[PDB]
Design a protein around this ligand. Structure first.
Ligand SMILES: Cc1ccnc2c1NC(=O)c1cccnc1N2C1CC1
Lengths: 395, 543
């Protein structure tokens, strides 16, 4: 028995155009799909079906085998509708790919048409191969839901037999957190792996990083100026930040290189601001009824800074990401990684993907991101122009 | 020749209903014809007579038949897009031979969804009852007829394909391109086999004695199964030239620019300036003459290439033609081009060569993926150091697939570089600008540590043009090494980005100025604060 599902009132199925793919990735799919066809998970469709959703293939480099990924973002948005602060604190959380479970469940006939997608051909030599789902599609919002029941059961055992652990599900991913030192955590997981079969993350380390002010032995007109600007901007967050004494040391038309001693008051004003900046600003609270936002700036040399916030100047969390182990000189690589990492934390903390604001040109992102993606889900995003200001700050 | 292929189930847009239009008169002649014609299809099985229950109808015509479903189509569900994607020659892979079986009758021979047929009812015209039938097959000019015909085609081909892997087929409207690596007779044979297989489903197709012959002409080319040639292009020789003529000429010439090196249209395009009507005539300037003649020569030389060899790598090389213009050629073996093209300067806001090259490279990568499913190894007229220098410092994420430097000037370089720290022993200009946004009157000036100073009033300017202006003056009245401090973020941004081309004159001026200088350091400070020399110019450019 399959539960009936409907599109929000008035809405119609996606008719998103398919992106062109690499040979490498095209083959992967015909393979993956002829298999799914045999097993009857999906089936070829007729021209009378006008809907479409983009598909492509990635590999969580947790394998060398290819995995099929469908971009239901559009569909999910057009689909009717129907979280623990725990892990948010846990010592360690591990993520599990349960996409599979869905393929065990059949999809309401009347709704299948909407899940249509297309395997393209090169140079257009041929028409693409069109299929539509017969089971619950991975990445579809409706799936985790409908599979809820079956899911809860399956878990319950490991649940109240390990209550000293938290288990959260987000789409095709299961987040499991415990305080058990690495030894028991890793084993308890494998213990859970087999349990499901029979059918590294660290939350607290994520704080709003501190704004640091530079310390010089000698200050030039330039130096002071640069410091006053940063401070000034910073006053938006901390209204207590004063810049008067410093603005004094600068009055007159001096040369930028000219060195300037700091008046004892300038000294104070400065020391006082350093203090204020020793803690995130007060009164910042996650508002469930508002969109989460993630913004990222390219600091260069491999670094990237970012902020999750809902309202301007009231950051919920901020961070930096640098390139570890693996000669990576490829921005796009880095940015996709960066975006995943971040979407991940959001999910953990609040269990919601953030709306991204990317420092890259549409064309560039579109042409290559897919090449580095390694997640069952896909957040929302828009492209922008980094104001040099916001950059020197988080730098 | 009706097909015994399962029909595609059709339906009308959500909650709509069949066409109910009425036709009153036509001549004795126009009625005689239609009666005959119908009776023909009638028997062929194409159509049938309907009666009791069909409340639907449509205007029938006679043209020296024609049925207009304009209304039916509006009420017909949407189908799956036929796909505008077209194979491009450079994508094709060499074959020994390739014929084109022409279906034609194609659609008219495909069963129409039974259920839907009712809606396809039409009447013939002054007694009592006239003549009424309904379609039984995919009707000429109907909405789903294309879509439905191709799907059917594909099904019918699917087995044959699976049994003849070696054999490639391309379905294009009413034509079948079948090529292969078999010998001359084995091929001719398979085509025949293919034909009876098609004719085995009511899909009549021409015999070996009637099919069209190679090379086939395709979206611009003349192509055989082992090579292709740009079907040569001629330019009309004429006494008088109308605007319209000129325009088409430019289009042809423009298209040629892709394949043909050296084509130009500057003086030819000039002729359009001021034109009052398409039918107007323009005295071809002598300069236009020289150019027109010149192109005729370039068009004379034949150009031909070859297809893609999966067993070889692609190589794309780019040249910097003018400012923002780029030429590129793709090949698997030197001088043996697979495809070439050109990209016009995308005149935009404020950019620079490295960024632009980056885009060209991006455009090509995309195109290449579409055609070959792979991205070429690139040869770029840019120094590795240049690229490193630029990217590691550009605020935006940028990238270039694996490539290598090819020293084929002119090369793309950075026209100037801002200093990382203030210049020791260089004048310091504290520039500022601002304009009343209600009147658009503004002031822009500066002051320096070296006592110097200047200011200027401006009309109809805007805030941003003012601040830019301010920096221009500073750049002007400054000499080889400068330190400029502005309170404008707009400017900081623009310039911080090291632009070498813009559509704003002032910005161009500044750029020019920037290239001129020996060392320039631009710095920014918050506007309207007690801060430095800023509060000095702040006061002088007021309102
Ligand atoms: C127009 C067209 C589109 C796609 N492929 C082809 C063609 N036509 C050809 O003449 C052709 C030429 C060379 C190689 N493949 C070709 N064929 C392939 C089918 C044998």
């Amino acid at each position: 028995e399959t539960v009936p599902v409907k599109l929000k009132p008035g809405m119609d199925g996606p008719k998103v155009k398919q992106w062109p793919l690499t040979e490498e990735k095209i083959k992967a799919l015909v393979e993956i799909c002829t298999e799914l066809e045999k097993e009857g998970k999906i089936s070829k469709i007729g021209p009378e079906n006008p809907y479409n959703t983009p598909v492509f293939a990635i590999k969580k480099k947790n394998s060398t085998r290819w995995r099929k990924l469908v971009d239901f973002r559009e569909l999910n948005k057009r689909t009717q509708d129907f979280h623990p602060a725990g892990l948010k604190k846990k010592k360690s959380v591990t993520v599990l790919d349960v996409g599979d479970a869905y393929f065990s469940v059949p999809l309401d006939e009347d709704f299948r048409k909407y899940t249509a997608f297309t395997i393209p051909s090169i140079n257009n030599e041929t028409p693409g191969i069109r299929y539509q789902y017969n089971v619950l599609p991975q990445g579809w919002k409706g799936s985790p839901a409908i599979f809820q029941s079956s899911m809860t059961k399956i878990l319950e055992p490991f649940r109240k037999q390990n209550p000293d652990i938290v288990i959260y599900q987000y789409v095709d991913d299961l987040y499991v957190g415990s305080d058990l030192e690495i030894g028991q955590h890793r084993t308890k997981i494998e213990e859970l792996r087999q349990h499901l079969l029979r059918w590294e993350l660290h939350p607290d380390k994520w704080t709003v990083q501190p704004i640091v002010l530079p310390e010089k032995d000698s200050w030039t007109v330039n130096d002071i100026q640069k410091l006053v600007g940063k401070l000034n901007w910073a006053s938006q967050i901390y209204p207590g930040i004063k810049v008067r004494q410093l603005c004094k040391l600068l009055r007159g038309t001096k040369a930028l290189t000219e060195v300037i001693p700091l008046t004892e008051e300038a000294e104070l004003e400065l020391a006082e601001n350093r203090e204020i900046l020793k803690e995130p600003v007060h009164g910042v609270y996650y508002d469930p009824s508002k969109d989460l936002i993630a913004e990222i700036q390219k600091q260069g040399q491999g670094q990237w800074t970012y902020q999750i916030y809902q309202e301007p100047f009231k950051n919920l969390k901020t961070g930096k990401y640098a390139r570890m182990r693996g000669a990576h000189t490829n921005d796009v690589k880095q940015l996709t990684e960066a975006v995943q990492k971040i979407t991940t934390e959001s999910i953990v903390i609040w269990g919601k993907t953030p709306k991204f604001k990317l420092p890259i040109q549409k064309e560039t992102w579109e042409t290559w991101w897919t090449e580095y993606w390694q997640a069952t889900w896909i957040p929302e995003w828009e492209f922008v122009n980094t104001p040099p200001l916001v950059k020197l700050w988080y730098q | 020749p009706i097909s015994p292929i399962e029909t595609v189930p059709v339906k009308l847009k959500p909650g709509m209903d069949g066409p109910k239009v009425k036709q009153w008169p036509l001549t004795e002649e126009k009625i005689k014809a239609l009666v005959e014609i119908c009776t023909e299809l009638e028997k062929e099985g194409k159509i049938s007579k309907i009666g009791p229950e069909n409340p639907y109808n449509t205007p029938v015509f006679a043209i020296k038949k024609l049925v207009d479903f304009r209304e039916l189509n509006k009420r017909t569900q949407d189908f799956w897009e036929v796909q505008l994607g077209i194979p491009h020659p450079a994508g094709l892979k060499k074959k020994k031979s390739v014929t084109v079986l022409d279906v034609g009758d194609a659609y008219f021979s495909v069963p129409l969804d039974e259920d839907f047929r009712k809606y396809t009812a039409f009447t013939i015209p002054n007694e009592t009852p006239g003549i009424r039938y309904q379609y039984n097959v995919l009707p000429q000019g109907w909405k789903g007829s294309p879509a439905i015909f191709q799907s059917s085609m594909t099904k019918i081909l699917e087995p044959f394909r699976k049994q003849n892997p070696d054999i490639v087929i391309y379905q294009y409207v009413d034509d079948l391109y079948v090529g292969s690596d078999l010998e001359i007779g084995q091929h001719r044979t398979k085509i025949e086999e293919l034909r009876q297989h098609l004719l085995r489903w009511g899909l009549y197709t021409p015999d070996k004695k009637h099919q069209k012959e190679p090379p086939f002409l395709w979206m611009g080319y003349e192509l055989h199964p082992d090579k292709w040639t740009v079907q040569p292009i001629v330019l009309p020789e004429k006494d008088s030239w109308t605007v319209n003529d000129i325009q088409k000429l430019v289009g042809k010439l423009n298209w040629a620019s892709q394949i043909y090196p050296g084509i130009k249209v500057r003086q030819l395009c000039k002729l359009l300036r001021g034109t009052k009507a398409l039918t107007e005539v323009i005295p071809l300037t002598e300069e236009a003459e020289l150019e027109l003649a010149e192109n005729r020569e370039i068009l004379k030389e034949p150009v031909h290439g070859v297809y893609y060899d999966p067993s070889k790598d692609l190589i794309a090389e780019i040249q910097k033609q003018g400012q923002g213009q780029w030429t590129y050629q793709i090949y698997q073996e030197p001088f043996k081009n697979l495809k070439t093209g050109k990209y016009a300067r995308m005149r935009g806001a404020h950019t620079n060569d490295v960024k632009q090259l980056t885009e060209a490279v991006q455009k090509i990568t995309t195109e290449s993926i579409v055609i070959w499913g792979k991205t070429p190894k690139f040869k770029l007229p840019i120094q590795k150091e240049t690229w490193e220098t630029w990217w590691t410092e550009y605020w935006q994420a940028t990238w270039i697939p694996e490539w290598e430097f090819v020293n084929t000037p002119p090369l793309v370089k950075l026209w100037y570089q801002l200093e990382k720290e203030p210049i020791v022993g260089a004048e310091t200009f504290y520039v500022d600008g601002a304009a009343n946004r209600e009147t658009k009157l503004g002031k822009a000036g500066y002051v320096t540590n070296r006592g110097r100073q200047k200011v200027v009033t401006l009309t109809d300017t805007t805030n941003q043009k003012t601040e830019l202006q301010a920096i221009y003056l500073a750049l002007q009245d400054s000499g080889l090494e400068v330190n400029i401090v502005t309170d404008s973020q707009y400017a900081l941004g623009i310039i911080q980005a090291q632009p070498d081309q813009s559509e704003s004159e002032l910005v161009n001026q500044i750029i020019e100025q920037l290239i001129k200088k020996e060392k320039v350091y631009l710095a920014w400070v918050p506007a309207h604060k007690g801060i430095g020399g800023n509060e000095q110019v702040d006061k002088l450019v007021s309102a």
